[PDB]
């Protein structure tokens, strides 16, 4: 039930998220683009600084008036093929170097922590106040610096499949925002898009997103979703923790199979007023795919001995999820104190460094960082016994992978539907049917991906916003309108890209998309979007 206090909490969370995104963008620009800073910051340092900034900002709001507040989604920096889960800790730099010695240079940016020109950096972070969660995610491009131009500007725009992915993600984000804002004014929906008397449907969402992706020659990564957000139920760990009820549209390998052949989420809903929606879209480029293939995900482990592949990434996830349905008394006093600290976080993923007493740092000092690492050692000692008794689980690091359909069709599975992963610790991904019609399980699909010689990794671009459908009493101007709590032209400003693809204006869906854009730009007789502003610091 939307109300004044709920709206204020959502707005405050969105403002803090926007300010944090501006802070990380400024730090990355000053380290790699402006190059005025003496020292280039690395990815774990940027993540730690982001989390400290978020905590210091959130300290001043709703103090002793809200039971639970903090970081909802820990800061994540995903580069290219990595599509999520990359939040490495500061005590793992040498571990990453030792683990990935003797490998290829494909994941060199993630291994070293230093960004390189031509990289797609996806920054994701979220903030919750009293269970009301606002999350933002934005893709940006790293550019080389021109030496002759008086002002710091890129030498040239991004070109190719990465540009295709960024353009597809940006345009799909804007189009979905406009379509969802059209739910409050059902009379402004174009006839070509759908019924004038009809509302907004998950089928319409799916066909618009798929039309944009197919027009830009990109695939929707199976992590993407457009869903509804409630209190403490924001999909902060969607593939891990099961939810009783789901109202949204998701994309999977099963959906790819259905398109090619043309608790459970279903695209058979109607968007209602007074609701909060999360839109996370990941587009993977298909530039190097000479055939028709399937987009899926690969999990990264920390075992260098499982294979001989030189292009393999070996890493350890940095974020953990607490399972409050499981209880087991630990033998270690360190483990018991760590679990006491973990239970204070709540139902959101957390980092080990977030549990330290030093964090967040007030005066950033080398001695403070040393005390933080000293705490991290004992935290890892406690976490070893915590995870071994299934009290907490890891959020996996994932890479987008492309598998051709001919290999899948030629393959044989003697078990079919019956097979599943019996050694999988997590329940939800262990029992999975990525291809229900072909009867191919997740373990069989992983076998196919490993056995295929032409299974490649696709660069991914991400855009994720949070919106609220404010009614007449909820909104200020006495008419319903869309409030974008995170993202917009100020924080999520698109990078300099150029792509050779475009929407074809001869399609009914494309014409509907263009009419949505025009009606959104019409600020008098069109749609009304209010964008949350990042607060000043200095």
């Amino acid at each position: 039930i939307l109300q004044e206090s709920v709206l204020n909490k959502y707005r405050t969370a969105g403002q803090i998220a926007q300010t944090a995104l501006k802070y990380v963008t400024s730090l990355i620009n000053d380290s790699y683009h402006s190059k005025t800073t003496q020292r280039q910051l690395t990815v774990p340092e940027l993540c730690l600084l982001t989390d400290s900034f978020i905590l210091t900002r959130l300290e001043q709001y709703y103090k002793n008036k809200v039971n639970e507040r903090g970081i909802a989604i820990p800061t994540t920096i995903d580069i290219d093929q990595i599509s999520g889960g990359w939040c490495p800790e500061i005590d793992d730099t040498q571990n990453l170097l030792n683990w990935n010695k003797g490998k290829d240079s494909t994941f060199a940016s993630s291994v070293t922590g230093t960004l390189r020109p031509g990289d797609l950096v996806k920054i994701t972070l979220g903030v919750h106040i009293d269970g009301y969660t606002s999350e933002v995610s934005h893709t940006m491009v790293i550019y080389p610096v021109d030496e002759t131009k008086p002002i710091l500007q890129p030498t040239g725009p991004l070109l190719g499949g990465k540009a295709d992915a960024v353009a597809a993600a940006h345009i799909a984000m804007e189009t979905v925002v406009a379509l969802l804002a059209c739910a409050l004014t059902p009379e402004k929906l174009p006839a070509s898009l759908g019924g004038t008397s009809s509302g907004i449907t998950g089928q319409l969402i799916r066909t618009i997103v798929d039309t944009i992706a197919r027009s830009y020659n990109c695939g929707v990564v199976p992590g993407s979703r457009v869903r509804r957000i409630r209190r403490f139920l924001a999909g902060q760990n969607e593939g891990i923790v099961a939810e009783r009820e789901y109202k949204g549209v998701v994309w999977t390998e099963s959906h790819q199979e259905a398109d090619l052949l043309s608790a459970i989420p279903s695209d058979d809903f109607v968007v209602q007023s007074g609701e909060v929606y999360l839109i996370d879209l990941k587009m993977a480029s298909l530039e190097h795919c000479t055939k028709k293939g399937l987009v899926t995900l690969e999990t990264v482990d920390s075992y260098t001995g499982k294979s001989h592949k030189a292009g393999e990434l070996i890493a350890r996830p940095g974020a953990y999820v607490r399972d409050f349905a499981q209880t087991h008394i630990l033998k270690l006093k360190t483990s018991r104190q760590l679990l006491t600290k973990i239970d204070k976080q709540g139902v959101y993923p957390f980092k080990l460094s977030h549990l330290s007493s030093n964090f967040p740092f007030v005066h950033e000092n080398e001695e403070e960082l040393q005390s933080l690492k000293k705490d991290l050692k004992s935290f890892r000692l406690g976490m070893s016994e915590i995870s071994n008794n299934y009290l907490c689980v890891e959020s996996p690091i994932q890479i987008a992978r492309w598998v051709p359909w001919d290999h899948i069709l030629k393959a044989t599975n003697p078990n079919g539907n019956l097979s599943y992963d019996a050694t999988s610790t997590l329940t939800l991904p262990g029992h999975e049917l990525p291809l229900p019609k072909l009867g191919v399980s997740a373990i069989k699909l992983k076998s196919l991906m490993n056995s295929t010689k032409e299974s490649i990794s696709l660069p991914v671009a991400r855009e994720c916003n949070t919106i609220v459908l404010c009614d007449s009493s909820v909104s200020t101007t006495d008419r319903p309108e869309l409030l974008r709590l995170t993202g917009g032209s100020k924080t999520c400003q698109p990078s300099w890209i150029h792509s050779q693809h475009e929407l074809n204006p001869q399609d009914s869906i494309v014409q509907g998309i263009f009419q949505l854009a025009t009606l959104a730009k019409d600020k008098r007789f069109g749609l009304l979007l209010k964008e949350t502003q990042p607060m000043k610091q200095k």
């Binding site: 620009n29 890129p154 359909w405 300099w496 890209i497 475009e502």
Partner: peptide, 26 residues
């Protein structure tokens, strides 16, 4: 066979531009 029919259908079905942003660092 339903699996045979699905595999046959899958085999039968598989067998300017745009510019965003500008010369600046946001």
């Amino acid at each position: 066979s339903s699996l045979t029919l699905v595999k046959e259908a899958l085999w039968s079905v598989i067998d300017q531009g745009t510019t965003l942003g500008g010369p600046f660092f946001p």
